[PDB]
């Protein structure tokens, strides 16, 4: 649209991911690690 | 939480997959609903506010 | 003659004074005295009116059953916190006056010192004495030791949060 935008970054507030952490077995690194990867909401509650 | 942390650390350092001990009990082998399968732990966790906080008002009013 | 023109010009200036997009000649102007970093003088004598007493009593009535929450450095809400849990966390040095808290009477998350009556509730004399002990004899030597042990803490840029924990 031919307007300057290099002085700023278009984001007034930074977008920060908000996900709690927990400790568990990665089974890929085979290490006990703290992460924040939860099961997807498309499968939560439907089956185990 | 402290006991689980220490136990999981000790088990991980020993070369085995750590386990988490649940307050209230383990799961029930059922095929209907997720709440029924984990009813004991959910029952324990649902009493968090009454178990800790006092019933009477915390501050003082009228004085 | 000139008075009417001056009045019209002043009215025109009043019309666009608070238009923050318009630059103004009084911006970044030279102050009457050279600028020196000052601080607001600390009050000494305070006399509360009955209006303030009753307003404080009403606010204490509204918040006597509140349950508070706070946010950590990773922007995650942390625990159901009744008053004694908040006091214990304050004593342990986990939270301070700059932590973001939420209660029943608010709409957003605010710093702890910006909530109306949250610091007077926490700061009982025992809490003050215990937090002073914890700051002076546990956290400060550990901070000194961790600064000395690891060079990743740049000496020119060092935080001073431990110094003001007592308050
Ligand atoms: C029988 C059970 C009680 C035995 C001890 C007797 C307590 C008698 C006096 C208590 C009134 C305390 C509040 C006074 C009001 C007042 O003047 O506050 C003074 C002081 C608060 O001190 P500040 O934080 O102002 O100053 C600390 C300075 O060192 C920092 O500059 O409060 C206390 O000393 C708290 C006492 C806790 C108890 C200390 C002993 C713990 C014993 C544990 C066993």
From Swiss-Prot, chain A:
Signal sequence, renumbered to the chain: none
Portion held of the full protein: 1559 to 1606 of 1995
Subcellular location: Plastid, Chloroplast membrane
Gene: ycf78
Domain of life, per lineage: Eukaryota
Disulfide bonds: none
Purpose of the protein: Essential for cell growth. May be involved in binding chloroplast DNA to either the chloroplast envelope or the thylakoid membrane.
Protein name: Uncharacterized membrane protein ycf78
Family listed: Belongs to the ycf78 family.
Species: Chlamydomonas reinhardtii (Chlamydomonas smithii)
